[PDB]
């Protein structure tokens, strides 16, 4: 199937309390494999996946060295953006950067993306053509102007179309045992009477991978999305994910409701009935 | 752009030499390269930002400091003859399109200063045969007996430097190529119209800027101290 590699950056300024805090994490699909915390003791790119351990010491030296340059680059960007918005010099602000590339089942390049944010709002994003930028406010025009004159779109494209997918394919081959397999959900249903007149019926999905999953209730075939409690897909902590879905039922009409589990690890969709 | 200072420096073995680089392009990264024949440009030190420096391909014998985002200095605690090279400073970004290069610093490190000699400059008036045949007058200026190599020759006509009709030899030639620490010679040409040379009101002067010892350098010999100075020779126009 399709695959992706993404890197998440968070730079939060700490005026007076020291140096801006920089956090970087790298994901292959839904599996984290690198880490960097500017406040960590090691001050190095740390491995977070078993299949990335085999990379040589030159790998960890360069990624640690390169990711530090991003924190240094973001350091001046916090100050530069404060002047754009005329913000207080003591206030704390955050810059978020997300970039990566996607590949298909054949391993060929599919799409690359690069997006930047400031204080939780979109600031500037590289368009899907990898040749133009999208500015979110007037302050972004300044960054867009400075990046257009610096051929930033070409430089980022040289990575997304180049070294990004090349190392994406290398990671997938190295982690075939863990990245290219699917874990089907461990589904079961539970019963909870609210009172002696109504009851709550919950459908469970345990220990599945990847995150994408669909759980739907049906009353005699009719979807009950309006009368349904849905919780966000959540991590179990062991690389697998969890999700449960509820519906309120009459005392004697449990059999009228069925829960449907849709997941790419299941060859056929499951139907759960009480 | 990017600026460097000093542009030319003569150093003694075991001395301390510091080169300062300034950039107003407000780039994140600053670099120090050295250019040597047969090696191209070799990175020495670089800085991903203010307050941090990183060792390059050949950091031995060299020190770097990044006090601010604009200034990035290279410190030579103990200068050696092997460090005689041309040093370039670059400013750029991590995945940058371009690296912006400074004007470059020509550094010559010598074991002993007793071989340093200022140049002797003389101006030679055009031949009448050339004027008769081609109606153009050529002036030849010789700067001889200077060491080290880096000198700057300029032509000054009536107090104005002239950039047209002038070429200088690309390389100085050794007076005695046999001997080490040989004294060098350089020549330059200036061609103008024959009528311009015939006017006696036009003053022609050849200027050679010699870069040598500074004020702080010590000297205890009888002959004139070969300090960084200017040696000039002049020739007046003649109708003849």
């Amino acid at each position: 199937g399709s695959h992706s590699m993404r890197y998440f950056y968070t730079s939060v300024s700490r005026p007076g309390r020291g140096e801006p805090r920089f956090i970087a994490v790298g994901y292959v699909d839904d599996t984290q494999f690198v880490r960097f915390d500017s406040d960590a003791a090691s001050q190095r790119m740390e491995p977070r996946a078993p299949w990335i351990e085999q990379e040589g010491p030159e790998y960890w030296d360069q990624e640690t060295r390169n990711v530090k340059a991003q924190s240094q680059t973001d350091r001046v960007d916090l100050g530069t953006l404060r002047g754009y918005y005329n913000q207080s010099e003591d206030g704390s602000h955050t810059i978020q950067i997300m970039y990566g590339c996607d590949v298909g089942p054949d391993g060929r390049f599919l799409r690359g993306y690069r997006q930047d944010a400031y204080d939780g709002k979109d600031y500037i994003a590289l368009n899907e053509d990898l040749r133009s930028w999208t500015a979110a406010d007037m302050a972004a025009q300044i960054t867009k102007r400075k990046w257009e004159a610096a051929h930033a779109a070409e430089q980022q494209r040289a990575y997304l179309e180049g070294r990004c997918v090349e190392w994406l394919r290398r990671y997938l081959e190295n982690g075939k045992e863990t990245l290219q397999r699917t874990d089907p959900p461990k589904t079961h249903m539970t019963h909870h009477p609210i009172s002696d007149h109504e009851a709550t019926l919950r459908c469970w999905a345990l220990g599945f991978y990847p995150a994408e999953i669909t759980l739907t209730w049906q009353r005699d075939g009719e979807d009950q999305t309006q009368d349904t409690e849905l919780v966000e897909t959540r991590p179990a902590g062991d690389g697998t994910f969890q999700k449960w879905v509820a519906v309120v039922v009459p005392s004697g009409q449990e059999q009228r409701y069925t829960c449907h589990v849709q997941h790419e690890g299941l060859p056929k969709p499951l139907t759960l009935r009480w | 752009a990017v600026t460097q200072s000093p542009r030319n420096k003569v150093a003694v073995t075991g001395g301390k030499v510091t080169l300062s680089c300034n950039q107003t392009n407000n780039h994140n990264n600053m670099y120090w390269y050295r250019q040597d024949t047969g090696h191209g440009l070799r990175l020495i030190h670089y800085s991903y930002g203010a307050g941090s420096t990183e060792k390059g391909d050949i950091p031995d014998g060299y020190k770097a400091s990044r006090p601010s985002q604009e200034n990035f200095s290279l410190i030579l605690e103990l200068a050696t003859p092997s460090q005689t090279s041309v040093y370039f400073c670059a400013s750029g970004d991590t995945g940058g399109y371009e690296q912006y290069f400074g004007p470059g610093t020509r550094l010559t490190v010598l074991e002993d200063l007793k071989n340093v000699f200022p140049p002797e400059v003389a101006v030679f008036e055009p031949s009448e045969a050339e004027i008769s045949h081609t109606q153009k007058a050529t002036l030849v200026c010789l700067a001889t007996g200077f060491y080290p190599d880096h000198v700057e020759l300029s032509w000054w006509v009536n107090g104005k430097e002239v950039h047209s009709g002038v070429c200088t030899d690309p390389q100085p030639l050794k007076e005695q190529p046999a001997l080490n620490d040989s004294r060098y010679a350089l020549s330059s040409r200036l061609r103008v119209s024959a009528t311009f040379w015939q006017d006696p009101r036009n003053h022609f002067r050849c200027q050679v800027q010699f870069y040598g010892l500074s004020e702080n350098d010590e000297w205890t010999q009888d002959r004139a101290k070969p300090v960084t100075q200017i040696v000039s020779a002049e020739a007046w126009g003649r109708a003849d």
Partner: peptide, 9 residues
């Protein structure tokens, strides 16, 4: 691998 181009905002 890290590939974010830090041109500078």
């Amino acid at each position: 691998v890290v590939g974010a181009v830090g041109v500078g905002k």
